[PDB]
Symmetry: C4
Subunit: 345 residues, 4 copies
């Protein structure tokens, strides 16, 4: 009762667990440095999403000072985007990124001369002709690293690299605010997607960015273990003070807004078919604390895997599949939490 | 320990995700024409269900104008069913369909004389002696395309085609209001159902109608991608103004009544054993808006699969299986939804 | 896992596949065998449980072509009186339950004219059960149903020692906790399939006991090899059921407990069933009708005019949790009750 | 093939399996529950209370040893208060008792041994590490006492610890009620598979496996042992009891007493640190003896169904099936509303 078009089972983060290794490294000893693109390096593998409710200059500066990096979003006029990147990199000469859309060549040139360090050429569907052509023209008119996405296949990864991609960004449907997989029925579970694209990208030494889906620090580890060089994360940071967003109080708890870029209110700035929704998140206050627990989680992970660098994590990692009942085991069960903890909201 | 009567794992829409392909086509540019039966074609692949709470002249004209078609139900006397066909057909010469049950041979005859374009010969169990007979009985006395259902096996569909079926409706159990799989314990998960029937029907150039189970626009893309020529929808249109039945209000919001044809009220028109229940659905106002975003979801899908027609969708589509945790990924997770979206409610 | 011997499936796990059919549900024959010598008109048995089956319930099943097993949780003559009342009423067929080593109880029941005796146990595949089985068969002319088991080997051995019927089911009952307290059991479909592979070779009927929630489960159970099903909770809420009706909301309930529960045992005892509560569903007859209606519907879709033909022609697919939600009513809110689906 | 080359297979946990009944001549009351705690120390029952500051101190340890099991005093205190605590147990009839220590705590260990502790539990969130192996070697060279080392979940960890003098191996990473390791670090192995793998190595060497964490119900005991463990370690069940340290609180009309991970913020204080446990509460379940009685009742019942008169016969004759979520629904109570609460089944 099985069909010719079934190409296998796809796995998400909650589907797997990482297997502990013989270890002689402490979590405090772990190197977290990583390549963002082929030519840009980072000291922590974290990237804040290119979203209007997540990353502007204040988020980027915060990211860059902690060793990561932020991608200013393109939902604004061209050189107000330039002002954002001028702010960050006048500020301690920190390293920063910016996003552009299909054929937005003028926007990109400006950002480059504003000193932006990486351009993220993003799209609902990176493995597309308009994307490929937009990438070729950039690399011919501009000397700057370009991350391209989003994609989820071998074929996409390979072809984008063959045309100049300095980084490949993975993820269709995994985001907290994404409805693509429901509206269009399209996607690939984030672990399998990162796996497929790693097996090609690593051949060329091109970094993969695992975009979307990250819910707990343990997910950061899984993503990297499987072949990512960094993760892009939206909803975790959208709770912080540094995200742009309007705070609201509905009951006894305070929230601020987090919406998809393919959401109706995002596209207005109708007869539209949206693939993102508009939502809120619990306000988690200060950035530096959220990021620290994320980094804490990853160090703990790599220690369990006896891996002192991302690169050693790739060599030594393995995982087991788990069931729904395995996941139940993995979470807290049968006891009732008396104090909120930042790790585990 | 496994058993010899187990013939495999049957999959439904939530069990899979369609995988992106290289695309040179934008959702805008996609063609959606399809074949309803081998001699009748539609310009969108959508059919409204033959239900007393879904389709009548008003729904049918609305469907036809949009480029689809409506099947007027048979929960009425013969002459009034004919009246319904005349209403749709005098209104712009639009295509329209009518359902008949087994042995209902003069009903069919009248309907055809009334200029109906297709007859839908329906039964809970399409693959039975009486349906075959009724089918051969219509083709001999009438010149009209006949759709036959419902079935879910490939031998069921081969045998209906051999006796003159112009289309086959697939679906046992998947309906929103269907209890056949619980009362009788019988059915096949809709994807596996469509796959098996496609593998026979397509070699004869006979269209598969995937009937029942559609919950979101991405479901439509899945159904067509694995072989369907079109889809039949009840509950999504049941809550439109153009639906028959009247609104009633329980709380803040108003609901419009949707029931099975196998429900007791439906068969009332009580020593009965029902395979359908009686329920309510959100009133979602005008159908045009409802349908508008179904079509947009499909286009979005076909865009992701680089397919500019259903033909190419058939050639190029592949899918992965996902776990229930992969499904938790695909939906919105960890964010509270601030405002309504008709795509996703 | 070395010890992993495969995946076991329950009723919710599968769907039956439709066959070419030329038989209407109304035309289907539901005759079957209880034991190799006792046959029924409908393949239903009410559970030998003190909240389910006494004389008023047993006479109820036989009425509709089935049978009920009077429970052993009473003294001998009172059980004997229960079987006398059913026999004296229309001469209808009835059964009664006894425990291990309770041979005396047994022929009192036999002398009272019981049609079938159910030798039951938490664990039918045990030395003591085989002992009692063997004395009974030597001192009494009676069909004996033995349980509960879930393996090929248990089925084979019980039959080799004289068993006239075999009850299958360890842990599926609505009120059972065995799989939680002991960690033991086998999912009901796989269990029936295992036991039918042996039992049908010998022409010994299997009773699928417990776990039945909807009429679709009856068809599944028979389709994979059972000759009948035993039913507790569906019937515990009926009128002809013993036990008592408490009102708590604006809806009516009556109690239903496991025979391995604290109240059913009366305390340093180790409970393996619980004390519970079930919606009152009025008169039995309507419940049975809807169950038979469901099964006739099932066999219609499979083009099977009898159980023997249902055995020959049935296949199933496995479904996910997601398939299961497709299968139930989804995304529509139900206006008022239906008997089938509640 | 959407199959990843780093995928080494499916891991299973207690709720994923069911034990299959065997022919039986033995009754639950006839079954032997003796087992080996460590290579040289043995118990009347396979139960061990957890080394947690909300579960085991002398009163719990005494209570355990009474019933034929053993308690492990937690290390979340100074050195000779832990010593005094094992003194309390030993002067209560020479009962068996154990004590936990951490990496490089050789001094504490020495003081524990001098006080007559029967076993030292060398614990760590990651038993398969350089500093644990070293600590094991140093203890074994300067002292004579059985050392249990954990926690691990792999064959090679199991092998490497035995090769360096481990007398018992404790299995479990992420399974516990108050544990968030698998969410914070994304690391662990489902408990059944974990015990299996570690059993396949340890049994050859005659080294007992202690199954640590994840026990929700008595039938989980039988499963851990049937798959190869010689004992199970239990926290949350006993945390609710009377002899548990931690003082009661009432929030509902129901009493609770607190239960926290040793890797919880509060426990570690005993803000700039990263939690792999949480701080919670459990229903007060009254006196210990009833709770332990029910768990033993359950196991005896398991072993009866499996026709196994001892743990070694259980290891030989056990088998299981994988079940699905729907199988688990079948297994729990269903379609019935519970009128009287049951200690078996909370
Ligand atoms: C690039 O062409 C395509 C576009 C779509 N759909 C969209 O672009 C919808 N959309 N329209 C605008 C946006 C957006 O800003 O951000 C998104 C992020 C993720 C997913 C979608 C969007 C988005 C579907 C298929 C194809 Cl082939
Ligand atoms: C075709 O004969 C059969 C009928 C049934 N049951 C029914 O059709 C009951 N029923 N009785 C009336 C109806 C109905 O109007 O619409 C249905 C839609 C789906 C499923 C059932 C019905 C329905 C079962 C098996 C067989 Cl073989
Ligand atoms: C004595 O044989 C055994 C008995 C048990 N347990 C019991 O019989 C407890 N019990 N004690 C009385 C009963 C009972 O009436 O019905 C039951 C149904 C299922 C499970 C248990 C019972 C039950 C478990 C294993 C074995 Cl090997
Ligand atoms: C140095 O060993 C490691 C320690 C950790 N983490 C911790 O020790 C955190 N922690 N820090 C203190 C504790 C603790 O007392 O009990 C625990 C129980 C289980 C899990 C963690 C703890 C715990 C992670 C990876 C490695 Cl390799
Ligand atoms: O509107 C949307 N629809 C679908 N995906 C989106 C949308 N907006 C952002 N995304 C993706 O979701 C990611 C954030 O995922 P999150 O960290 O799980 O919330 C972004 O980096 C984008 O790749
Ligand atoms: O009462 C019934 N029982 C089972 N299926 C039904 C019944 N009435 C209609 N159907 C089927 O369900 C389809 C609509 O399902 P929906 O789109 O999921 O709500 C119809 O087109 C019929 O094929
Ligand atoms: O207390 C008990 N513990 C476990 N199983 C029981 C107990 N009492 C009765 N059973 C079984 O459960 C069956 C009924 O289950 P039900 O039809 O699903 O509610 C009975 O026929 C017995 O086989
Ligand atoms: O804070 C912690 N994080 C992770 N595991 C812990 C922590 N504290 C105790 N444990 C483990 O959890 C076990 C008890 O879990 P339980 O029996 O399921 O409640 C203990 O025996 C330890 O192995």
């Amino acid at each position: 009762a099985m069909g010719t078009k079934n190409i296998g089972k796809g796995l998400t983060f909650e589907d797997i667990l990482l297997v502990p290794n013989y270890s002689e490294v402490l979590p405090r000893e772990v190197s977290l440095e990583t390549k963002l693109t082929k030519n840009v390096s980072l000291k922590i593998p974290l990237i804040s999403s290119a979203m209007d409710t997540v990353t502007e200059h204040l988020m980027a500066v915060g990211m860059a000072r902690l060793g990561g990096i932020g991608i200013i979003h393109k939902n604004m006029d061209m050189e107000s985007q330039v002002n954002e990147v001028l702010k960050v990199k006048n500020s301690g000469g920190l390293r920063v990124g910016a996003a552009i859309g299909v054929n937005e060549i003028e926007r990109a040139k400006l950002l480059v001369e504003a000193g932006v360090d990486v351009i993220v050429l993003d799209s609902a569907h990176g493995h597309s002709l308009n994307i490929i052509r937009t990438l070729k023209e950039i690399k011919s008119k501009m000397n700057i690293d370009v991350i391209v996405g989003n994609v989820v296949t071998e074929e996409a990864t390979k072809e984008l690299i063959e045309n100049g991609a300095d980084g490949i960004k993975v993820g269709i449907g995994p985001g907290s605010i994404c409805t693509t997989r429901i509206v269009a029925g399209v996607g690939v579970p984030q672990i399998t997607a990162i796996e497929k694209c790693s097996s090609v990208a690593s051949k060329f030494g091109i970094p993969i960015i695992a975009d979307g889906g990250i819910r707990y620090s343990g997910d950061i580890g899984k993503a990297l273990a499987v072949g990512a060089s960094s993760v892009m994360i939206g909803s975790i940071l959208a709770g912080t003070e540094e995200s742009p967003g309007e705070k609201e109080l509905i009951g006894d708890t305070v929230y601020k807004y987090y919406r998809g870029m393919g959401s109706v209110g995002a596209m207005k700035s109708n007869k539209m078919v949206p693939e993102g929704i508009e939502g809120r998140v619990k306000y988690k206050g200060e950035m530096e604390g959220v990021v620290y627990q994320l980094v804490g989680g990853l160090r703990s992970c790599m220690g369990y895997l006896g891996s002192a660098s991302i690169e050693e994590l790739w060599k030594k990692s393995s995982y087991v599949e788990i069931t729904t009942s395995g996941l139940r085991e993995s979470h807290v069960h049968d006891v009732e939490i008396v104090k909120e903890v930042m790790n585990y909201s």
